[PDB]
Subunit: 69 residues, 2 copies
Amino acid sequence: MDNKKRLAYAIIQFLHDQLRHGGLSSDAQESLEVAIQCLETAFGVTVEDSDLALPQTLPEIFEAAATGK
Amino acid sequence: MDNKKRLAYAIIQFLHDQLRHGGLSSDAQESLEVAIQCLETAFGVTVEDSDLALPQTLPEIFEAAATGK
């Protein structure tokens, strides 16, 4: 299964609001915004991946699994 | 801890060789390449994150944890 779509889009969602929240620095954000739109086009994902969105955003899972393995 | 750096860079590594392998389509790859360099600048990560790289690349963990939760 193409979990990589969900990977991209879930990151898109988190980075979207992270951008709004101003988590990164200005230039970082701006570049990050480009990254988002590139990731969308890269994995060929869309907001249709929101229809099949997972209960929690994957970045959250990453903060658990990737930080503790 | 900034696991988000490791997130970005580990994805950078996988996407780097995925780009080379031609996993995505041409335009997707090209856009994905831009995404990589943007993610690098976004999270403010570098190849120094390779020095602190995790045993396995995080995309692998994602194929486990994100696909099965």
